[PDB]
Amino acid sequence: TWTDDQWNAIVSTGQDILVAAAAGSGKTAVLVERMIRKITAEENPIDVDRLLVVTFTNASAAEMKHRIAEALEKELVQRPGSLHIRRQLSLLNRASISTLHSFCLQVLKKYYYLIDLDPGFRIADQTEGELIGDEVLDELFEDEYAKGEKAFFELVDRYTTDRHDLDLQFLVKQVYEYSRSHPNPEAWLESFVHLYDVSEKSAIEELPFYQYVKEDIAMVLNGAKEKLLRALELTDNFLDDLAQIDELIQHQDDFSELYKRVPAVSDPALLDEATDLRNGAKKLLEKLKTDYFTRSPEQHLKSLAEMKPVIETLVQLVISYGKRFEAAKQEKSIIDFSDLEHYCLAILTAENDREPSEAARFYQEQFHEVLVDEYQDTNLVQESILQLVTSGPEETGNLFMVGDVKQSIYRFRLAEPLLFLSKYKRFTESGEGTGRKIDLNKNFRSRADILDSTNFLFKQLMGGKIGEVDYDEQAELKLGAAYPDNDETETELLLIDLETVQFEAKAIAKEIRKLISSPFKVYKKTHRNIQYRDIVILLRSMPWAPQIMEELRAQGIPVYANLTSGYFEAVEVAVALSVLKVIDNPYQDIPLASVLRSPIVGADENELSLIRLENKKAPYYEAMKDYLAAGDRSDELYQKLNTFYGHLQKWRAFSKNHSVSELIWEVYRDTKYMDYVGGMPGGKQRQANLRVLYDRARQYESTAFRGLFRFLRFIERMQERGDQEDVVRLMTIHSSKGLEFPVVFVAGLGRNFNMMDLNKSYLLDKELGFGTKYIHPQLRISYPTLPLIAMKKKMRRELLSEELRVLYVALTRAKEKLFLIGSCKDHQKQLAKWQASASQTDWLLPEFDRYQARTYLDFIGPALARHRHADISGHPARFAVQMIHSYDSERLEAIRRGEPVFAFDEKAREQLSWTYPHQEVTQIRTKQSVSDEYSGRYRRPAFMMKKGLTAAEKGTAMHTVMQHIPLSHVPSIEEAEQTVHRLYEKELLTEEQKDAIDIEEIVQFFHTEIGGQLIGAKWKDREIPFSLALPAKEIYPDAHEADEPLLVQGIIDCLYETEDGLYLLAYKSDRIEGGFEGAAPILKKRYETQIQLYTKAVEQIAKTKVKGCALYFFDGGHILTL
Amino acid sequence: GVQMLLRKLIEEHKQEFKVYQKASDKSGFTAQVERMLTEFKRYCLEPEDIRRMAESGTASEYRGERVLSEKLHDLSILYQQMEKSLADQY
Amino acid sequence: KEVFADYEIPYFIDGKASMLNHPLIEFIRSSLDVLKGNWRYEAVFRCVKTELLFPLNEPKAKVREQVDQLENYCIAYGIKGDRWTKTDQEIEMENMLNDTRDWIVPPLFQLQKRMKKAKTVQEKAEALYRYLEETDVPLKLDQERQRAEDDGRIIEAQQHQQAWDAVIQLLEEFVEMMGDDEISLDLFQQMIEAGAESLTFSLIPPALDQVFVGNMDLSRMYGTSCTFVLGANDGVLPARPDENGVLSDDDREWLKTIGVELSSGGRERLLDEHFLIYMAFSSPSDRLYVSYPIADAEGKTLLPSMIVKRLEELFPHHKERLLTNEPEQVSDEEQLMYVVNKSVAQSFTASQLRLWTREYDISDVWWSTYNVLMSEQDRLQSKKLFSSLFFRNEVKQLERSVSRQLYGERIQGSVSRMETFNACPFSHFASHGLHLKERQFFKLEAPDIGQLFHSSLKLISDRLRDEKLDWRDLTKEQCELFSYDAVERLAPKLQKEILLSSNRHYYVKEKLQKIVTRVSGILSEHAKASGFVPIGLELGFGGKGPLPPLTFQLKNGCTMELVGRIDRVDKAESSKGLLLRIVAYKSSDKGLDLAEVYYGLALQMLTYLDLSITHSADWLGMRATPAGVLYFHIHDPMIQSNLPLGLDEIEQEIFKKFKMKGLLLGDQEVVRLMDTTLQEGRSNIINAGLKKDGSLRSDSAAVGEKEFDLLTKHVRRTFQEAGEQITDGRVSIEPYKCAFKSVCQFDESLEENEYRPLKAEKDKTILEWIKKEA
DNA sequence: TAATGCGAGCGCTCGCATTAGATTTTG
DSSP: OOOHHHHHHHHOOSSOEEEEEOTTOOHHHHHHHHHHHHHSOSSSOOOGGGEEEEOSSHHHHHHHHHHHHHHHHHHHHHSTTOHHHHHHHHHTTTSEEEOHHHHHHHHHHHHGGGTTOOTTOEEOOHHHHHHHHHHHHHHHHHHHHHHTOHHHHHHHHHHSOSSOOHHHHHHHHHHHHHHTTSSSHHHHHHTTHHHHOOOTTOOTTTSTTHHHHHHHHHHHHHHHHHHHHHHHHHOOHHHHHHHHHHHHHHTTTOHHHHHHHHHHTOOHHHHHHTTHHHHHHHHHHHHHHHHHSSSOHHHHHHHHHHHHHHHHHHHHHHHHHHHHHHHHHHHTTEEOHHHHHHHHHHHHBOOOOOOBOHHHHHHHHHOSEEEESSGGGOOHHHHHHHHHHSOSOTTSSOEEEEEOGGGOOOTTTTOOTHHHHHHHHHSBSSOTTSOEEEEEOEESSSOHHHHHHHHHHHHTTSOHHHHSSOOOTTTSOEEOOOOOOOSSOSEEEEEEOOHHHHHHHHHHHHHHHHHHTSOOOBOOOOOBOOOSTTEEEEESSSSSHHHHHHHHHHSSSOEEEOOOSOOTTSHHHHHHHHHHHHHHOSOOHHHHHHHHHSTTTOOOHHHHHHHHTTOSSSOHHHHHHHHHHHSOTTOHHHHHHHHHHHHHHHHHHHHHHSOHHHHHHHHHHHHOHHHHHTTSTTHHHHHHHHHHHHHHHHHHTTSSOOSHHHHHHHHHHHHHTTOOOOOEEEEEGGGTTTOOEEEEEEEOTTSBOOOTTSOSSEEEETTTEEEEOEEETTTTEEEOOHHHHHHHHHHHHHHHHHHHHHHHHHHHTEEEEEEEEEEOSOHHHHHHHHHHHTOOSSSSOOTTTTTSOOBTHHHHHHHHHTTOOHHHHHSSOOEEEEEEOSOOOHHHHHHTTSOOOOTTHHHHHHHHHOOOTTGGGTTSBSEEEEOOTTEEOOOOOTTTSOSSOOHHHHHHHHHHHHTTSOOSSOOOHHHHHHHHHHHHHTTSSOHHHHHHOOHHHHHGGGGSHHHHHHHSOSEEEEEEEEEEEEEGGGTOSSOOSOOOEEEEEEEEEEEEEOSSOEEEEEEEOOOOOOOOTTTHHHHHTTSHHHHHHHHHHHHHHHSOOEEEEEEEETTTTEEEEO | OHHHHHHHHHHHGGGGOSSTTTTSSSTHHHHHHHHHHHHHHHTTOOHHHHHHHHTTSTTSOOTTHHHHHHHHHHHHHHHHHHHHHSTTTO | OHHHHHTTOOEEESSOOBSTTSHHHHHHHHHHHHHHTTOOHHHHHHHHTTTSSSOSSSOHHHHHHHHHHHHHHHHHHTOOTHHHHOOHHHHHHHHHHHHHHHHHHHHHHHHHHHHHHOOBHHHHHHHHHHHHHHTTHHHHHHHHHHHHHHTTOHHHHHHHHHHHHHHHHHHHHHHHHSTTSBOOHHHHHHHHHHHHHHOBOOOOOOBSSOEEEOOSSSOOOSSOSEEEEOOOBTTTTTTOOOOOSSSOHHHHHHHHHHTOOOOOOSSHHHHHHHHHHHHHHTSOSSEEEEOOOSSOSSSOOOOBOHHHHHHHHHSTTOOOOOOOSOGGGSOHHHHTTSTTSHHHHHHHHHHHHHHHHTTOOOOTHHHHHHHHHTSSTTHHHHHHHHTTTTOOOOOOOOOHHHHHHHTOSSBOOBHHHHHHHHHOHHHHIIIIISOOOOOOOSSOOSHHHHHHHHHHHHHHHHHHHHTTOOGGGOOHHHHHHHHHHHHHHHGGGSTTTHHHHSHHHHHHHHHHHHHHHHHHHHHHHHHTTOOOEEEEEEEEESSSSSSOOEEEEETTTEEEEEBEEEEEEEEEEETTEEEEEEEEEESSSOOOOHHHHHTTSOOHHHHHHHHHHHHHIIIIISOEEEEEEEEEEOSOOOEEOSSOOOHHHHHHHHHHTTOBEEEEEOSHHHHHHHOTTOSSEEOSSBSOEEOTTSOOOTTOOEEOHHHHHHHHHHHHHHHHHHHHHHHTTOOOOOOOOOOSHHHHOOOSSSTTOOOOOOOOOOHHHHHHHHHHHO
């Protein structure tokens, strides 16, 4: 069965539909069912190709195709005689089920000629793409420095940490990358200045950015009052402070008035804690003063209007960059992933004087409906692409989108969930003349306590400006699971208060084994213990991954986290690169030593120093050779070196005729480094690291770069900048997604969020555009600009909403059990801070205190306190808190030298001594010609060479004629010429070949005894091809072992039969006269072996016999018999 | 060698293109045309045959037909100009 | 090719092999690049390292030794473009660097002449060929051909002269079609470039006994017993309709209905997939294997194709096997299939011995395999391999005979060298022991930037004394006028004239200037306030210089003559007598961390002070007391204020940014001598203050003369205990809580390798620890 | 960036200046 909501999503049509699908909604299943209906139904079925389904991975697309299959055959068995359904089964491979990028590509390949894009264009990976960026960038900057424009230096001096210019080009990249998130990048870039164009005559409360200043001031002022009011409840001074504040609240609207007021006017337990709530006022009111009111509204205006010239210079720079960047790609027929979407948008839009081009008209026709998953993570460009292929205005139309804003965790990639959310507010639950929206609340996948815990937390957290979304019913998760009633399913929180991670990782490890030893069996299925693989520990970041992993392996099962970088500081990698470096340029002291001290060579520290002693001034490379040359052979250190120096020269030569990936593999097999590395701690990961180096070289040979040198820099660039088994899976929350686990640990909750984004002298924003500090290079003074502060106030509450959703995906990835591990210093006092926040009724915590949030803890803690004010505490959620003080043999030794002392003892020894019985033949060529690419046996350019022929070519010509001469009778000199000419006419002979023929030497043969015998014959044939099978050794005496037959293939020039027997005839253009008496013996055995093969070929194959063989020679017209 | 020739033809005759005028520039367009001509020969379609087809779609209003004929037209130019430089001596 | 090579499985591949990796193809390509990109040294060496440019008859060995050293030279000096076309140690070297470029430049240079010269194709095509012939590409190739055969590789030997034919023909057709058409390198090269990509080696002829590895489309087979089908993944096997060509599938589909039949190409091909899959599946007589990878080259997920499902429909009870490089995941039987070869046996068995020690029960097939490998000739090799089982990166102590001849007779110490040893004993051994060098680059590093400021400061003084002027007498005008000249006289001679190499650097010039100009004005203001007058400047400490070397005597023949550099020593007369202090110019923010001094990471200033103090006696004829150690921050600061300021207050804020950090003496006088402007409150010149009573504030970085001699003596003991360890030949690897890190190979997971912790200490805490020492 | 110190002015306040203390997420 289905839900009414799922039913709605499945069958609803006639307009755009937005499906808000909560975690475990079974959206996938309903998505499949929907298409299945339209495709396989009685009324009016449609083909799969008439649908457009976009997924965020090709894997999910592929999985989409499989279910669509599964159900198709099912519907096919029930309707065995359906021609249409069987056809659909064939369309799944041609159908459009893919990522948007995968679609864009299909579009570019089809309509490439509409823009300027090379077919067979190549998509560069994000690495080389940026490598090309740095390149064109350096070119641009150099040009600007050299051009000496005044404005440019003003920009440089201003944004560069002078003594250094690096910081500037990052800003340019940063800005450029941002603009690409817009349907019209350049326009948006020129939109920058519009903000900086003001006057002291301007209304601040009017312009765009003040919207966030207004709201900021509101919160703080109110947060002050509400923070003071309690001080009043605690029980004259608070009133003087309060009355003043209310006074400020009266003028919240007037920024100019605030500049007048704000700056100027502004039990031992409950007694000393009430002074803190008063200090709160001061602190809040003081930060408010410094932020906005330290300098006049008029001063802020002038400051901004002075920056305009700079902003303009900066903009045109980014634009010039983009142009050069695009040009560089074009040269190399290259596009980015950005280009993929923009070139698609270019094709879909043909604007003249905005027109949905003919290309778009095609897709609007083809696609009866379009389905988009994970819609909350859509960008503006994609959306404008979607609206471009979707046919019809919103009220009608075929746009179908599913997702959940609450699960939007990728805003740092510039995805805009407001797009999804703006439609959700614009759409009605019914479909009356508008977009139909549908909610999927039922979670068929998770246990009750989870949904209750997750629902209880975010009810008090997600909302307003910090949630961006109102948390309510039709939003709250609902129980659909049939999980049997069992306990110990209560959500746990373990508060523990460099070693931080240690105390936190231990605690986690503990209750894990508490789950292992104890049963806690996970579940018409059956119960089963924890396999370790059913428990997962989610971190928000991965600085702790390596540490946590360690001790969680120190006791019990190992830990598997999917590590990203730290790859270049990995020892294996360092050494491997060190080897490649020495192969490139042996003269590198450090890289050379790196290899010599690695297990690859294994030189002692004394041995290393012993080497230097030979030559103290020369590079370490020469010091090494100097040791070799003079050294003695029975020397161990010498043996280590000579072996290495041997490999080096091999690798050196190997690389110049092979690729980098090949050179790498060869080095791995020559040194057995990859094998060796698999035999040491964490060797499994080490081997992988070592083979991703190989794969990266593979990726590298498809790039616009080549050679070993470049590869080194390539990898060097990656450095300088960016870089079934049962086990605890340690991974980031962001990587969880549709993944799920019976038991989930979410740790590091007592740690700060990353706000580093809000530090620098500038910020980028979709709406407000560019924002920066006021900077005067000559006066050496700078300070935050009003837009800058506004952009930070906004960005802080948008970053915070994102984190709350990151925490929302974490708790929802749980099936049965949830563990929350946080950390701090003083337990009680924070619970007192938590108490302070937990007072206000209405469920949704104070909008300001949630704003002040820093650690995940500050979200949970207070939202948790009130629990264990009727429904709040009474809410069916189970929590378990724990306050933690945070303080509480022979075989190896045999292996170390010799061997130990089994069931397979006998088999193993045989297989290692085994050889291939027929191995001697495995290298021998099957077909061997005697004169097709399957057989075996200083040229100058024709334009720079002689005007004539070579002995070879002449001979080839001389040969052709003999084989075309009529054998009816003896030709005369002219009868021969006629033939030669006809061969010329029919193009069996080149003009050169024709003029090269010596007719006398051609007619001469037919006057010989042999010639006349050829003429007179019962039967004749020429140019006779043959294939003879011989035992392999009969040709190769070297390999005697195997008797397999090989094919010798050639052409017998001539054969003729008389009343005597069959005779063989061959013509040879061999050089003779320069007597022939003395050449005969030599010629005889130059063609000796060849003629025997012929006779053999004839005698063995024809089962007849060849009596006599003759060879005619054009030089003097000579004949010898064999 | 055919592509080299083609790149020469796609130069001069470029401005007679109804569709690929912009795509003629690109070096990956020569290989695409080279492949199309091969197919034309293998399937016994002479330049005269393509010209013929090109004006079968000319002036019959189904967009996609019009475009198709326009590309068949450009190909026709290169096709018949290739056969003209390969005539009798290649 | 790689796998079967290791598993010793002979094979035959349908496809041909590209020539883009062949020296001849590379040599040509990179040659055009040489003259196109205006002689980028990267391209030049790309050509020279195909060694087709190599001199004739000269032993290649030495040639590569020279080519490499020439490369290193060009990398550090940024040699590019025109720079090419334009005693004992020096000669040898520079007499190589000329010879090398002397045979490299001409053949490649004379080529660009002919090239940029010729207008049409044939003549540019001709110029290229003459570049090949005059360099004897044919000859040098033919030679290489032999080496390949001598080493048992005839297949590789064939491809050489075979490569030559490809190029020549490439030109013939080029000049045949567009020969007399006019063209210049831009399009010319691009055409040659596409020519290379198309080039192909001859198909390798089949052998009598091989595994046939081919495709699933136009490959043909006969009498096959066992057939393996690879890549049965989704979107792969039923190959998604390829999108290529000039005509879409709609165009072709349409054409059909007009009575014209073309190649299928679009959706028909997909219908034809099942026939080809059917022909592949029915190919073998005995066995059929259908396999699909789960992961991806990079690790993305891969699903099986619908065919596997269709197969599981016809064979619903068939189990599917699991191919894995982790033997422990399979039964003892399959585990016996890994021992096919010695190499592969070794590779796997090593990985098994590892996992076993991890308390996992491994199959006995590997123990049997182990004992076999230990019973044969190369037992040693496998022994070295298996030694990985217990590989703790371990450092053998330096013997006595080694360290004595390595480090030498006298250990001529350097404060920095001592810091280095105290940072990591191994790092010392790497730099001063083995004398290792980093490849030098054309980049201007941060360190050698400071050397500029010094040499500018030192230069300004000389100018001042010449005009009989002092920093105090300077005007804002002169401060700029003087600073700029200083860089002018220096800039050219700094770091391979890199400041003159590009345009960005000549903007870095005036930058380095504006900074010096501000610091010059700061020193002036500092001098009009300070009562400390500079005694000596850039004082020769140790070796050959003003002072004597400070010597160290330690047990077991330990002679340490350490040398150094004293930036500045200043003198001030007080009622307490003579006062001395040291000032060192830095680009950093802070100067002294007492915690950092305990472990001997910062010995610079404290050691400089001692000498000045000690020798002060027999030096000038008076006894000195330490005023302290100071660090001057050379920079052009940017102030950040929410308070609107006038140029008056801005000058102040900028001024305070140069407040000196360090360690002072804790008396009212010394403070007032270093800042005579200060009466009450904070000083902007030095980190100290005064309460109304005349006592200095607690915030003061000042300490008693006792604590100074305490820190002093501690440092003395540090040069001692660390001076002996060196002679004792200690190379231990012990980083704290590097350029030689790739030699260190420090691995924390690998046991016995530990990070020796350093604690963050309230100055007094360690000030207390050093108290307890003696 | 807060966040303590340390001085004053007058158990409260400001104001100056240095110190500490942690820091990413890539379907």
